[PDB]
Design a protein around this ligand. Structure first.
Ligand SMILES: *C(=O)CCCC[C@@H]1SC[C@@H]2NC(=O)N[C@@H]21
Ligand SMILES: *C(=O)CCCC[C@@H]1SC[C@@H]2NC(=O)N[C@@H]21
Lengths: 683, 683, 89
């Protein structure tokens, strides 16, 4: 009963379309991604060998004592979150993972988990994220792995109790995660210290990421000054971080600001490794990374050349070529870069339904005025499409700016940007301005994320909440102040394990109860879907998003040894219950799949009958047209008296009543062409 | 008889499709480009005022004594040649020209003519290029104009005699061109001096552009060394150039090479303005331009942010933002940049049939190994599509590299890149390798551009031709050595004016005879097309490329005052001659257009008859099937003897001959189901 | 079950077979614009025979060796493909 669920999925996708929401109506390309040649044998030695040999402090001293620029690949997580709405599957990553393991041994790390990959992998792709992590950990053994962990937000959207995040880092380090980049939205310091403690006690390398916004080189803006970042970095180094990081999530770091900030961090902490992360939204990413690498940055984040650009990271080939021959040489050969970007061009062609290039064709300097991050940009375009706002995204960006100013000049990264984007979609859908919605603040019903933020369930912003808005929206809802994670009670995780073993099965693991603690309803619907259709992980992307075509024999190997040569021969028409039939040739023998179509129902309405059991139910003895009614609705009549007269083709009849009674209502109007045995009078 | 030609064009585009070749099957977007608000009144003062007030040497001293970086916009010429196969029309440029005139007064110049715009404007767009030049010269009066002129190649593909290029620069300066950027493909010095003399004697500013290739920072490559560029620049300054320029047409300038070359040119010539032109193909354009502006470059080339990126120039917003607050401040406000790029995003949506983003979604570092320029990239993809090679463009790029090495390491820019691309398409279409085609060099038939190059009709490459290849391909064809333009006789231009006035009309101007000297057959076919369908310049792009839709009233104003409200009501089916009929509502009254469909013909073939006038033409008296022939082809028979027997539905007949004669041939085979009165025997 | 109508629809120009050097075919598609040979005489190698034009490209056909021109297989302005025969020789 394994190929039957797969054929049910394939027929359901053929007849009804894909169960994924599709924002751009397009098909996957017929061209396959070209995987290059990989030398057979064990891969080279990398930085994970020195990590497992001498710990995180020796890893930090090795990355600090490396002559030249080090790179981190973000193609597996942040490139397709910025460009393809986080929709790239584990199949296309596993096809290129041995090439990366053989040829990119000199990388610092590789971000391939965390962010929005958790929620999208369970929600839209029907995959387990721990399964992707384990598969790529077997495939790439020589390069350290890196995950993007929020403060007390783990991989969710709100603050969690401490035991859940500690257990989350414990199990993620158990599965294979090496480097943990911990950041917070509002730069709220105890949430950062909590996330750093949870990441450090699990045994992993800690990368304390400071969220950057504004401009430190512009003295006109004084809220997030250079001294603010210097004090934040001083306290984060005082908590025992191993690598400091600057997360510029919108792409706002300019070369002068880069030189100023990295030189301040280098002459304040002379032996601490600096990592810079930026997006190339404004079009100045490679220039900013060259400014950082000359100012004293150690690791910078890149992506493959076909998977970089618009809202993504800077390009790997441009960073390799722009440092060739310099003292900052990365000594990576450019031909391996060419083959890797060749693969990702072929693989990006498969995801044309979620692609950024259907709307945005080049960069945009207006990110200097709306400050939207890139992953949020593509996921926000999808979310605005799925709520009817799919043709008003410029107004969503304008209300984005308005909602940033209205909520008190927040630092927008994931959670806070999700709050500002929810408020922007609310202000677009209800036509409200800034002052127009602050005047009606005590009347309107803001969404759960905005009201939950104004309560303070994610933390406290810099300079405090907007207190007139917080007084007008929150009437008497509880304002839990201080730290949200030090107030909420710990979830009994063995109770949740006991709650989940009696619903799905007995292969429920701690990874599953962490998936259900982070997302209860998404894990429930994911488990129901994978009960119905089974492991759709090992399908290719054209098969997953499009199904097969007629008379084209395709090969599916679900598990080890179990191979299936499947043809799709015909699709019938609809049955009595609105169901179609699909005909397959599975392993050479004919099989049949019955799938419910989803559009051919809910089309019926007509006039009711005249029920014969009651003599006071006067109906039409013959069809035609009501030409005159002789009764007043409310009086009573005798039997034999005329009530209504009807006419048909050369025929006219007068309706008589069979007995007495009070005329309740005249059910028929004037000149209503009714059928036979249809009710004209209730009596 | 003016609206009738327009309606004939609109019906021809509706029924038959557009007469333009369409490489990507897609439609223009229903969204219109959003033109911003323009303040009413005269535009500000720019650099053309100081140009017209004190000449080119005062203009050169004003651009040399400007504190800060100056920008040149390339959105009108080089952006859409790099990205949209030079297909942007004058309508979409005229819609934004007053905004540029009001808001971008501090520009150096604006490249809006030359390059591939001449050939494409006559050939695929049915426009006069002088008409575009005159329209934009009325619309933008405050900014100097810039054109890209080849050496002795004017705006063509081969060397021309001196009088034609001198007359070309004379008439272009007469029409409104201010700055002339003169470059040569092989860096052949007398062609450069000829083009500089023709541009300088007309009265315009001379920008001597050195074509860059390779890497001056890499000492392993020694052919185009730094001293080679220094000697070339020394001789070009010795000929009296006003502004020097570095044309990096493939995007190969790195920041270290930029700093080295611009600092060498600045400490060799301390008062000469330097202009740098680059493409952003590798992804390091903004970094290279910041390196040039800090090294001492005066003007750099940018484009609008939605019209920059992949094979185009660096982005205007990134250059404005990355120099904000520095001593290199451009003092351009970013909001005007946002509105300009907003317009060009809306306008780029209209050209989806020619867009780069259908195949290439991001940059490419492989330009470091194939060295293809960007305008050539998009036009070469179109040319490979129109010769059946549309699905083998990676092989075209591989043979590009092979043909570069095979022809002796050329500098690839326009003419030479057209030669290398023609050779690459030839080697792809005939399966040849490099040594495999050099072994068969004396056998094969190379195209006219390759053989014409090996003769030396464009000039002499650096280090000489490949002499085994030049000996094997050229058997005894004339090798005109020295300068090609000092050998060819001058064209009698009054004779060509007399040749063209007796064919089209009496509104033939010197601009038209220069168009016919540069392109005879393209101007002839263009004049026939504009005789048939008239001035299609004032149509919008959706109307030009797609036609109208049914029951959607569209407004066309061809000329001053003459306005037309046109509806399209119906299209009939085909007539006897294969023609359809289109029904329009022109100005409120019903009109009819008869257009020839182009596919519903050339479908007929069957067996010939048996002609009755000759008694020796024995045919079938009734249909059926030949079941047996009783004659030997070659002998003669008597009348009454059986020849063939035929059978039909319950009927069988024996064929007798009417008279004697020699059986020439048995025209029917065995069991051929033939009709009645169809020939069975010639006799 | 065999359908009975969806067959007997194919015809086009024949190829130029590569095994014989006297089988001169089109190295690139386009349009025959001029033929420089008389059908019946013989030519030397390197002499022009036919000229063809495509999208911004024009090529002159040369013969690889000698031999008698049997027949000019292509007519005037016949838009033919690549590797399609123009001369039997
Ligand atoms: C669900 O659609 C996955 C994406 C949800 C929003 C994601 S979470 C990370 C990015 N930041 C943000 O505010 N939105 C993006
Ligand atoms: C015709 O299709 C116009 C484009 C023809 C080739 C053009 S000319 C300028 C560019 N350089 C080059 O070699 N090809 C492009």
């Amino acid at each position: 009963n394994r190929a039957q669920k797969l054929l049910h999925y394939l027929g359901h996708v053929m007849v009804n379309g894909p169960t994924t929401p599709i924002p751009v109506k397009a098909s996957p390309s017929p061209t396959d991604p070209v995987v290059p040649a990989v030398p057979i044998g064990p891969p080279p030695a990398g930085f994970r060998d020195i990590l497992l040999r001498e710990g995180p402090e020796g890893f930090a001293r090795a990355v600090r004592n490396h002559p030249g620029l080090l790179l981190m690949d973000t193609t597996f997580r942040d490139a397709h979150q910025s460009l393809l709405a986080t929709r790239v599957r584990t199949h296309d990553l596993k096809k290129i993972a041995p090439y990366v393991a053989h040829n990119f041994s000199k990388l610092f790390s590789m971000e391939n988990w965390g962010g929005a990959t958790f929620d999208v992998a369970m929600r839209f792709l029907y995959e387990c994220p721990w399964r992707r992590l384990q598969e790529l950990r077997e495939l790439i053994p020589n390069i350290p792995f890196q995950m993007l962990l929020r403060g007390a937000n783990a991989v969710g959207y709100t603050n969690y109790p401490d035991n859940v995040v500690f257990k989350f880092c414990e199990v993620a380090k158990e599965n294979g995660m090496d480097v943990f980049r911990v950041f917070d939205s509002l730069n709220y310091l105890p949430n950062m210290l909590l996330g750093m403690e949870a990441a450090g006690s699990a045994g992993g390398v800690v990368e304390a990421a400071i969220s950057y916004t504004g401009d430190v080189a512009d003295p006109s803006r004084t809220k997030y000054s250079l001294q603010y970042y210097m004090g934040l970095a001083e306290e984060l180094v005082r908590a025992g971080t191993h690598i400091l990081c600057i997360k510029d999530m919108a792409g706002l770091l300019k070369p002068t600001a880069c030189t100023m900030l990295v030189s301040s961090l280098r002459d304040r902490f002379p032996d601490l490794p600096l990592h810079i992360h930026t997006h190339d939204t404004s079009g100045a990413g490679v220039a900013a990374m060259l400014a950082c690498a000359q100012a004293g940055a150690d690791v910078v984040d890149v992506a493959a050349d076909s998977m970089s650009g618009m809202t993504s990271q800077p390009s790997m080939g441009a960073l390799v070529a722009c440092t060739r021959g310099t003292p900052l040489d990365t000594e990576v050969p450019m031909e391996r870069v060419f083959d890797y970007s060749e693969y990702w061009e072929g693989a990006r062609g498969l995801y044309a339904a979620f692609d950024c290039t259907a709307t945005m064709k080049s960069g945009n300097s207006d990110v200097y005025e709306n400050e939207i991050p890139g992953g949020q940009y593509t996921n926000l375009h999808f979310q605005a499409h799925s709520m009817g706002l799919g043709s008003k995204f410029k107004e969503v960006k304008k209300a984005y700016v308005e909602a940033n100013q209205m909520l008190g000049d927040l630092i927008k990264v994931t959670p806070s940007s999700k709050i500002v984007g929810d408020l922007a979609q609310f202000m677009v859908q209800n036509g409200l301005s800034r002052a127009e919605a602050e005047a009606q603040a005590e009347e309107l019903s803001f969404p759960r994320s905005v009201v939950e933020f104004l309560q303070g369930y994610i933390g406290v912003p810099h300079g405090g909440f907007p207190e007139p808005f917080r007084s007008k929206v929150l009437k008497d809802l509880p304002r839990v102040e201080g730290r949200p994670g030090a107030s909420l009670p710990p979830l009994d995780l063995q109770a949740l394990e006991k709650e989940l073993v009696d619903r799905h099965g007995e292969e429920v693991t701690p990874e599953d109860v962490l998936s259900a603690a982070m997302y209860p309803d998404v894990f429930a619907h994911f488990k129901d879907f994978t009960a119905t259709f089974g492991p759709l992980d090992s399908l290719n992307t054209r098969l997953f998003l499009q199904g097969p075509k007629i008379a084209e024999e395709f090969e599916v190997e679900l598990e080890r040894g179990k191979t299936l040569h499947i043809k799709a021969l015909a699709v019938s028409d609809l049955n009595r219950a609105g169901q179609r039939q699909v005909f397959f040739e599975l392993n050479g023998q004919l099989r049949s799949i019955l799938v419910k179509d989803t559009q051919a129902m809910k089309e019926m309405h007509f006039h009711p009958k005249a029920l014969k059991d009651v003599k006071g139910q006067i109906g039409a003895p013959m069809p035609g047209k009501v030409i005159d009614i002789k009764v007043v609705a409310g009086a009573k009549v005798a039997k034999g008296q005329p009530l209504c007269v009807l006419s048909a083709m050369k025929m006219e009849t007068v309706v008589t009543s069979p007995m007495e009674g009070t005329v309740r209502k005249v059910h028929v109007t004037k000149d209503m062409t009714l059928e036979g045995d249809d009710l004209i009078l209730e009596i």
